[model samples]
Target: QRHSRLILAILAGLGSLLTAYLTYTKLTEQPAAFCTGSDLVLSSRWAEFLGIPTAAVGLLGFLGVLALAVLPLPLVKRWRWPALFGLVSAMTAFEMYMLYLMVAVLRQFCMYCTTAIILVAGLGLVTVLGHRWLDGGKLAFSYILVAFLTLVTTIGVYANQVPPPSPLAVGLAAHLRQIGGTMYGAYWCPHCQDQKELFGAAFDQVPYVECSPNGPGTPQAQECTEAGITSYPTWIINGRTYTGVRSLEALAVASGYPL
Candidate 1:
């Protein structure tokens, strides 16, 4: 029990710090180095909920868990089981949804997110054991069952909608094409899809070089290799190689396109 508490505290502490950094990057509109893909999965619109960075939510949740692990307040300790159950269940369920978005919808993977999920799951497991040991597993099943139902409800209601591009974005895409700039991406790359989603249908206006063996549209894997491309969603603008998902505004600035 003592060891589990210590381990949970450590894991939650680390998770909080990791998420805090991610929140900072999201708020500052800076790129994240912790995630693997260029235009990291964090830059995707799905990273935000109610116009707030999801990392902020993660930071708060982990911080709460850390507090519960270390604090000795009687009031807190008394309801710790319910608190841990609810918090961990919510976080775990949300992580599952995010994983689905990354793999099925976005087609990208984030190491930082993956790490957070593992940490949360570990903490959840420990908390469940603690609950079981403390109360003979009373209410444990009900807590988890309710949480699972909430997850299903949320997933059913959530909708991913892509809006059409503005005229400025359309014009920018056209200008990028006219300026001899090109985008390299693979169909299997989620970051690439995120970049394309930003442009909506206007993406067809940009000069794109597909870099997968059987990628849709046009497969230019050989061309991508010839140009030393090794990453998804790499951009060539003014003879410089830029990798990752870039914002439309950032792209405009990079290409010297009039906003």
Candidate 2:
């Protein structure tokens, strides 16, 4: 039992480190660092929730996971299962959301992010299947503790990393006008986040259409509903609607830019 705990703890540590690193890389630089598939990046929402890059959220979340691994086995029993299930479940849900963006929206792959997802899923399974830690009730507490730690740290990191609007936002916006380009997107969608990144603050005042009424700051979600945008990051150029995430090269090609 002791040895099993040690092994699990070590594995958890490794998992946490890997995940945290990936999150850090994504938040600090262009989304290009970690999400290699294309220029797609998640919306910078939670970044403002605290004031830091949301990746900082991942860093804190996984840091707690690493700490949880080293906790005494008896204490582990106190909150193990709860921590296990809660952590896994939360991560699974988020990972699923990320996958949805990558597959359905971004249409690209982030190998590092995928690796982290697998690690979280695997650890969750370990918590459930491990025999050394019994006592289901106490185990639930462990899960709660872990979840609480992750949540708190997530907030702290977020509060510290909020990004300012890119200066390029202005230029990107002006260029769009000069080139006869218009970006159409659901203000509420993450794909829209990616599209925004492409233009930075330059597109801040650029003409855009809201495709989802359910999203915040959408000028006309109802109009979006009528226009029929089932996806985020949709773009209209010259007179055509482009759906899903597009690479800069592809966008340039579409824009008739000289390659």
Cα TM-score per model? 0.61, 0.46
Candidate of highest TM-score: 1
Write down the lDDT of every candidate, Cα atoms only. Answer: 0.75, 0.56
Per-prediction backbone clash count: 5, 23
Give the lDDT of residue 256 in candidate 1: 93
Q: Please provide, for model 1 over 1-259, each residue's C-alpha lDDT reduced to its tens digit, 9 standing for 90 to 100.
A: 4436778789898889999998888788744311222245766665675446778878888998888777756756568756766777778778888877777876666888788888888877777665365575446576668668867765644543455566677888889989988988786555677788888878889899878746333545688878877678889998888877788888988999877
The C-alpha stretches of model 1 lying farther than 4 A from their native spots are 1-4, 30-39, 102-108, 131-146, 149-195, 198-209, 212-259
| Model 1 vs truth, CA RMSD | 6.6
lDDT of 2 at 197: 63
Taking the tens digit of each residue's C-alpha lDDT, what string does model 2 give over 1-259?
A: 4325455566567666765564565556543211111123343344233544444555665666666666547745767645655656555555555556566655545576567667766666665676634555755766566656665664455445535545544554555576766665654455576666665545556667755445343344565456555556666777776776665556667766544
Give the residue spans of candidate 2 off by over 4 A. 1-3, 26-50, 73-77, 132-259
lDDT of 1 at 40: 53
Which 10-residue window in model 1 sums to the lowest lDDT?
A: 30-39
